[PDB]
Amino acid sequence: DVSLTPSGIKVNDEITLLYPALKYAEELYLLINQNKINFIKSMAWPAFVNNISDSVSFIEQSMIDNQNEKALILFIKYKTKIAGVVSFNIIDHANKTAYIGYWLGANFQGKGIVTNAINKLIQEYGDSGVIKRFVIKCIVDNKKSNATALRCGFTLEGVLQKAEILNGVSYDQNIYSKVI
């Protein structure tokens, strides 16, 4: 499979899902910084990304988790730029289940980048039999994520009551799945 390269997973002619590396720290930090105000609306961690060293720490931990298959953290490269992150936040090996996370900078939204990335990951891990069940969990009112999940052929399984906390407030999540 020539799409599985040493540096990452080639989705199409424009998108590569890069294995994390320290060289990416600067660009990743700057991207997060540019999007901090909007990102804080849907994710908890951006509020605390205050310097490049925070992105270095994230990369270091991500490489450890990737090595040990605890997670699969990938940096989305669109053309020449890092566009965001797509991940298996958690890999449950015993139950062959992967929990998916993602984000894109504002300048990279509306381009199908995450839909294309997810479809590629599900082909690679799902059609190979490594993962049986893929899961997306996001806050109910996350309109754009819901659209992405449905676009990728996920099914809504239910609402997880008061399951995600942002800034001290618990919010309901939709749980979507795609089963091979």
Ligand X SMILES: Nc1ncnc2c1ncn2[C@@H]1O[C@H](COS(=O)(=O)NC(=O)[C@@H](N)CCC(=O)O)[C@@H](O)[C@H]1O
> Under the criterion CB under 6 A, does residue 111 sit at the interface with ligand COA?
yes
* Distance between CA atoms of residues 88 and 117, nearest Å: 12
Beta strand ranges found along the chain (DSSP E): 4-5, 8-10, 15-18, 72-78, 81-92, 97-104, 133-139, 155-166, 169-179
Phi-psi group of 178: left, alpha or beta (phi > 0 → left; psi -120 to 50 → alpha; rest → beta): beta
22 lines the binding site for ligand X (CB under 6 A): no
112: partner contacted, choices ligand COA, ligand X, none (Cβ within 5-8 A by kind):
ligand COA
- 99 marked ligand binding residue: no
Out of 16, 35, 87, 148, point to the residue binding ligand X (CB under 6 A).
87
What would the x/- binding string for ligand X be over residues 88 to 107, using CB under 6 A? -x-----------xxx----
Span of 2-10, 19-27, 41-49, 115-123 interacting with ligand X by CB under 6 A: 41-49
Q: How far is the CB of 126 from ligand X (least distance, A)?
A: 18
CA-nearest of 124, 120, 118 to 145 is: 118
Residue 174 in contact with ligand COA, rule: CB under 6 A: no
Q: How many residues bind ligand COA (CB under 6 A)?
A: 19
45 binds ligand X, rule: CB under 6 A: yes
Helix (H, G, I), strand (E, B) or coil at 61: helix
**Which is nearest to 133 in space by CA: 165, 177, 164?**
177
Known binding residue 145? Answer is yes
